[PDB]
Assembly symmetry: C2
Homo-oligomer: 107 residues x 2
Amino acid sequence: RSSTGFLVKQRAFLKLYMITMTEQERLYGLKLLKVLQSEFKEIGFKPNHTEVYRSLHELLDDGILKQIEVVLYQFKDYEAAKLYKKQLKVELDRCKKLIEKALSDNF
Amino acid sequence: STGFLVKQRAFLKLYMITMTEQERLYGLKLLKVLQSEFKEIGFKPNHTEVYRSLHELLDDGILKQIKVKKEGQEVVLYQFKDYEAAKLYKKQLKVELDRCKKLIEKALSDNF
């Protein structure tokens, strides 16, 4: 039920960024979708509404984030979050390695 | 071949084409073979994935099947059928891979 299959759940990926935006205090439920799409327009990945907001609601659900004048998000359980980023760093490295293996193996 | 990150099936096929370039896409061993490449990187492909990939490459016509055998019988080896299309695909996937590697590089430097 965690963050893979093959490469890395797009929702893991997104969750990563949301934490990194929660530290930095810039995690506003406002133009969220717009920001995220703006972060990545260039490597041609356009995260859709549903995916962004499932990433977001899952983090409230795992008690990682909390809601607060629009809506801002702070850490409910920053501990769980801290460790969670460290789970992604490993996932992303594995992923980096796998692409590189493919690159070197096939070219 | 994509959308977020590269499709597992596309990824598999690329290997399959290279293995064919290396004159070693064998019928028999196959699934064991692949799972063996990617163990040690936490990717273990399943039967459906690998055979759907192999079968697409035939249906689309990149590969033809052959019979051959070496000592101790006949045995199945996969060969190119439209190697030019096989070549295109490798070029397509390069572009795709380079992107994924970029996307992961952004992630790593954006959050750590």
